[PDB]
UniProtKB/Swiss-Prot annotation, chains A, B:
It comes from Arabidopsis thaliana (Mouse-ear cress). The chain holds residues 33 to 586 of 704 of the full protein. This is Boron transporter 1. One of its GO terms (molecular function) is solute:inorganic anion antiporter activity. Expressed in proximal side of various root cells, notably in the columella, lateral root cap, epidermis and endodermis in tip and elongation zones of the root. Also detected in the epidermis, cortex, endodermis, and stele cells of the root hair zone. Observed in cotyledons and hypocotyls. Efflux-type boron (B) transporter for xylem loading, responsive of boron translocation from roots to shoots under boron limitation. Boron is essential for maintaining the integrity of plants cell walls. It is a multi-pass membrane protein. Changing S42P: In bor1-2; reduced boron uptake. GO terms for cellular component: endosome membrane; plasma membrane; vacuolar membrane. GO terms for biological process: borate transmembrane transport; cellular response to boron-containing substance levels; monoatomic anion transport; response to boron-containing substance. Keywords: Anion exchange, Cell membrane, Endosome, Ion transport, Membrane, Transmembrane, Transmembrane helix, Transport, Vacuole. Residues 25-43, 103-116, 178-194, 236-252, 317-370 are extracellular. It is found in: Cell membrane; Endosome membrane; Vacuole membrane. Belongs to the anion exchanger (TC 2.A.31.3) family. The chain crosses the membrane at residues 4-24, 44-57, 82-102, 117-137, 157-177, 195-215, 216-235, 253-270, 299-316, 371-391.
Length: 399, 399
C-alpha cells in the first residue's frame, strides 16, 4: 500500500499540471469550445481503463487546434459542429492505427530514438515557450474574446498586467526549478528534502497562488490528419514504450480508444513514462487517473498567469535533457572557453575536431524550417512528414 | 592615458550608483530636505581635493537620518534649520577627529579587521536590504509625502505598483549579478566578456530603465554624535587604509573636510577602496570625481524602482565576501550534508569539531542585538559603542 501510494501521489501531480495547462490552452485557443476539464477526461478515462504514458501531449492540442483552424475558416463548418467533427476524424485516425498497428510498430525502434527525437523534443519546448509568451500577452487585452466592455480591462493592462503575467509567471519559473534542484541543495534537511523537491512544482502552484491571491467532401478530406497523426503517434506513443522499457531495467490499442475519446470530446507522453518505471527496482495507473477523476472536480474547485510560468517552465525543463540543445549552445559557443569545458560525454575523443560536430547546423536547419513552417497552415499541417521525408533518409547520407 | 582611463571609467560608475542611491535615500528619508545631488557633492568635492575610499557610505546616511530624527521631533528645531545644524555638529565632529587623529589612528590596525568588521559589513547589508524592501513598499502609497490627491495614486497601487517595484527591482537584481558573474561565463567571447561584466551594473541601469520606459543647549548636546561618529569613522575610513594597503601589494585629514562639507550640505567606503588598488601591479581620483561632477548634472539629466533593485542587490553583494555570513549559513546548515562540502578554508583541520565553530552564536547574538536596537532611537544612537563595549573586550574572553 504505502509503496505504490508514493509514486501515484508524485506522478498524479506531475501529470495534471500540463494536462490542465493544455486544457485551458484549449479554453483559450479554441475560443472556449474545448475546456480545461475535457482535456482531463482524455487522460483520466483511458488511464482508468488500461487492461504512465497515457495523457494529453501538446501535439494532441496543436492538431486539435489546427483542426479548429480547418473547420472555423472553411465556409459552413464553423463551430458547434466541431465537437463531432473530431469524431469522424477519429474514425480515419482509429483505422490508420488499426491498419498499421503492431505490424508497423515492429519497425519503429531503430531510427527515431537514436538521432531524430532530439528535434521533436526541442520543437515542443520551442513552441511551448512561445505559447507561454502568448500567455504572458493574454493577461492584458485578450479580455475581448473573454467579454466586452468590462470593469476589469481598462487600467488592468499597462498597469495590473505587470503583476498578473510578469511577476507570477517568472517567479513561478525560478522558485519552481527548486523541484528539479532541491535534492543536492547543501544547507537542507535530508528527511524532508525530497518532500520539497519532488512536489516542488505543485507546491509552487500553492505558493504562487497564495502570493497571487495576497491582493461530406471534407469528411473524405479528413484522412490527411488521421494518416499524419498516425506517423506522429507511432513516434510518441511508442517512444513511451522505448523509454519505459529502457536498457536500464496492445501497441495498437490506441486506435480503439481514439474512436472513443474522439466521439465524446491521448498519447504516450514523452516526459511522464520514464518517471513511472524507476519505482520498481530500488497496477498503479488506476489510482493516479482515479485522482485525475478527482482533478476533474479539483480543476473546478481549484479555479492563472502562474500557468504560463509553467508553459515556459515545462518548456525550459527539457533543455538539459536534450543533447541537441547542449549541441546548439556548444555550437554557438566560443572557441577558447570551449577548451575549459572539461562533463561533456557527447563530443568524445574520436571526433576531437569541432568541425566533426559541425553538422548540428543541419539538424538546426531542419528544425528552424519546421518551426518557420508550423506557424502557417498547410505547412502547419505537414510538420511530421518534414521529419519523415528528411531524417530517415539522411542517416545513410550523413558521412 | 588609456591606462588610468580604464580604472576611472569603471570606478566612477561603481561609485556613483550607491551614492545617488543614498542620495534619493535622503530625498525620501529626509522628506526632501536632503537631495540626491547634495550627496554627490560630499563625494565629488572631497575627491577632487585629495592632496578611492572617499565617498558617502550608509553610516553617513543613517546618522544624517538619525540627526533628522533628533531635530524634527524636538520642539523647536524642526526643519530648515537642520541644514546648518549639521554644521555645528561637524564642529564637534571635526574636533573629535583632530583630538584623536594620527595618535589614535596608530592603534586601529590590530583589533577590527581580524574579528570585528565581519559584524559591521553584515549589519550594513542587513539594514540595506531592509531599506530596499521599504523602497519596494514606496512604489505604492508613499505618494502622500510626495503630494496630495494626485492622478497617479489610485489604481497605480494594488495594480501598477506590481510592475513598478516588483518587476524592475528583482529583475535588476538577477540580471545585474551578471556583473559579478560574467567573467567565467562559458559560452561567451573573451574580448568583450569583461565589457559586459565590469560595467554590468550600470549597463543594467540602462537595460532595466529601457525595460521600465517601455510603457543652544542642544548644540552642547551635539558632542555625542560627534564622539560616536569618531569611533565609527576610525573603523571605516582607516579600514580603507587597511584594505587599500593590503598584504597583497592625513589619516586625520577627514576632520578638516568634515567642517567643510558639514557647513555646506564623507568617509572611506568599505567596498570601493580595494577595487582601486589592483590596477597598478598587473593621480586618478580627480578624474573619477570630476566625472562625478558630471554625475551632478547627470543625476539631473539622468532623471527608479530599479534603484531598490540596487539597494537589495548591493546589499546581497557583500554576502559571499563575508565569512561570518558563510558561518551563519554553515551554522544553520544540516549535519549530514555538511560532510559533502569538500572549498571551506575558514573551518580548517585544527577545529574539526563543529562545536569549535559554535561561538558564531555570540557574534550573531551581538548583531541581532544591535539590529533590534538600531530600529529604535537612543539605541539607534548607540550602535558603534555596542561594538566597542563588547567586542574589543571579548578577544581575551574567547577561549
Amino acid at each position: 500500500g504505502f509503496r505504490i501510494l508514493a509514486p501515484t501521489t508524485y506522478i498524479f501531480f506531475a501529470s495534471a499540471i500540463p494536462v490542465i495547462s493544455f486544457g485551458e490552452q484549449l479554453e483559450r485557443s479554441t475560443d472556449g469550445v474545448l475546456t480545461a476539464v475535457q482535456t482531463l477526461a482524455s487522460t483520466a478515462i483511458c488511464g482508468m481503463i488500461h487492461s504512465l504514458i497515457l495523457g494529453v501531449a501538446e501535439p494532441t492540442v496543436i492538431m486539435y487546434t489546427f483542426m479548429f483552424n480547418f473547420a472555423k475558416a472553411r465556409p459552413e463548418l464553423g463551430r458547434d459542429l466541431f465537437l463531432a467533427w473530431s469524431g469522424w476524424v477519429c474514425v480515419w485516425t482509429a483505422l490508420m492505427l488499426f491498419v498499421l498497428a503492431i505490424c508497423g510498430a515492429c519497425s519503429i525502434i531503430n531510427r527515431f530514438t537514436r538521432v531524430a527525437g532530439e528535434l521533436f523534443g526541442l520543437l515542443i519546448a520551442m513552441l511551448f515557450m512561445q505559447q507561454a509568451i502568448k500567455g504572458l500577452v493574454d493577461e492584458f487585452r485578450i479580455p475581448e474574446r473573454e467579454n466586452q466592455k468590462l470593469k476589469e480591462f481598462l487600467p488592468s493592462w499597462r498597469f495590473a498586467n505587470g503583476m498578473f503575467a510578469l511577476v507570477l509567471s517568472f517567479g513561478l519559473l525560478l522558485t519552481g526549478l527548486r523541484s528539479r534542484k532541491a535534492r543536492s541543495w547543501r544547507y537542507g534537511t535530508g528527511w524532508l528534502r525530497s518532500l520539497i523537491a519532488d512536489y516542488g512544482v505543485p507546491l509552487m502552484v500553492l505558493v504562487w497562488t497564495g502570493v497571487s491571491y495576497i491582493p461530406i467532401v471534407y469528411i473524405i478530406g479528413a484522412f490527411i490528419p488521421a494518416s499524419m497523426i498516425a506517423v506522429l503517434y507511432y513516434f510518441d506513443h511508442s517512444v513511451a514504450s522505448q523509454l519505459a522499457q529502457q536498457k536500464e531495467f496492445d501497441l495498437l490499442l490506441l486506435g480503439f480508444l481514439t474512436l472513443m475519446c474522439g466521439l465524446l470530446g491521448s498519447n504516450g507522453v514523452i516526459p511522464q513514462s520514464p518517471m513511472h518505471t524507476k519505482s520498481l527496482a530500488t497496477v498503479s495507473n488506476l489510482l493516479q487517473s482515479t485522482m485525475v477523476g478527482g482533478c476533474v472536480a479539483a480543476m473546478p474547485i481549484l479555479k492563472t498567469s502562474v500557468l504560463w510560468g509553467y508553459f515556459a517552465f515545462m518548456a525550459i525543463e527539457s533543455l538539459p535533457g536534450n543533447q541537441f540543445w547542449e549541441r546548439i549552445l556548444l555550437l554557438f559557443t566560443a572557441p577558447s572557453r570551449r577548451f575549459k569545458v572539461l562533463y561533456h560525454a557527447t563530443f568524445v575523443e574520436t571526433v576531437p575536431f569541432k568541425t566533426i560536430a559541425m553538422f548540428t547546423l543541419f539538424q538546426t536547419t531542419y528544425l528552424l524550417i519546421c518551426f518557420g513552417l508550423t506557424w502557417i497552415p498547410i505547412a502547419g499541417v505537414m510538420f511530421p512528414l518534414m521529419i519523415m521525408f528528411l531524417i530517415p533518409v539522411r542517416q545513410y547520407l550523413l558521412p
